[PDB]
Design a protein around this ligand. Structure first.
Ligand SMILES: Nc1nc2c(ncn2[C@@H]2O[C@H](COP(=O)(O)OP(=O)(O)OP(O)(O)=S)[C@@H](O)[C@H]2O)c(=O)[nH]1
Ligand SMILES: [Mg+2]
Length: 164
């Protein structure tokens, strides 16, 4: 089984930690705002994903840099029902990917919380996150629901599929 270091970032409350343990434990666990980081190795399609879950609160976003070096794939998780902060998510996203340290990272977007009445569809997120305006770079917007599991594995698959 080949290995892949995945860094997972997003605004506070996007659902990063939930994705982590749904993937790993298969259950929907109780979480708290992440202060340091979490780490689980998830093995799917003969590949060992090394997934790092980092707190998203504003004061601790400067810590994200510490984790860049090494990362082969970025998973950026978005609350799709959080219309007030999508612009903010755009910023942070672009900061990540432009840092020389992530020049060669594959970019998986989790458009999360799709179960919620205002799902702000996948195509929306894609345009609203200024992804369309990005070529010469491997990116995909996966719809998901972290509580149920929908899209999660499908995202892992894309990272498997899109890693040379
Ligand atoms: N309805 C719904 N709720 C979700 C979904 N994903 C996560 N949540 C809920 O949102 C809450 C916060 O998610 P969490 O996983 O802790 O965010 P986080 O990205 O880790 O946030 P932080 O630690 O960076 S501050 C949890 O109570 C969780 O159950 C989803 O797809 N749908
Ligand atoms: Mg967290």
């Amino acid at each position: 089984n080949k290995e892949m270091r995945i860094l997972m970032l997003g605004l506070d409350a996007a659902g990063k930690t939930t994705i982590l343990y749904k993937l790993k434990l298969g259950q929907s666990v109780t979480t708290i705002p992440t202060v340091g980081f979490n780490v689980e190795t998830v093995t799917y399609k003969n590949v060992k994903f090394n997934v790092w879950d980092v707190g998203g609160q504003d004061k601790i976003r400067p810590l994200w840099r510490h984790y860049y070096t090494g990362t082969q794939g970025l998973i950026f998780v978005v609350d799709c029902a959080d219309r007030d902060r999508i612009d903010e998510a755009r910023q942070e996203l672009h900061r990540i990917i432009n840092d020389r340290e992530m020049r060669d990272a594959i970019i998986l977007i989790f458009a999360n919380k799709q179960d919620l009445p205002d799902a702000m569809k996948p195509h929306e997120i894609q345009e609203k996150l200024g992804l369309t305006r990005i070529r010469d770079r491997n990116w995909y917007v996966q719809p998901s629901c972290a509580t149920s599991g929908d899209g999660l594995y499908e995202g892992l698959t894309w990272l498997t599929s899109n890693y040379k």
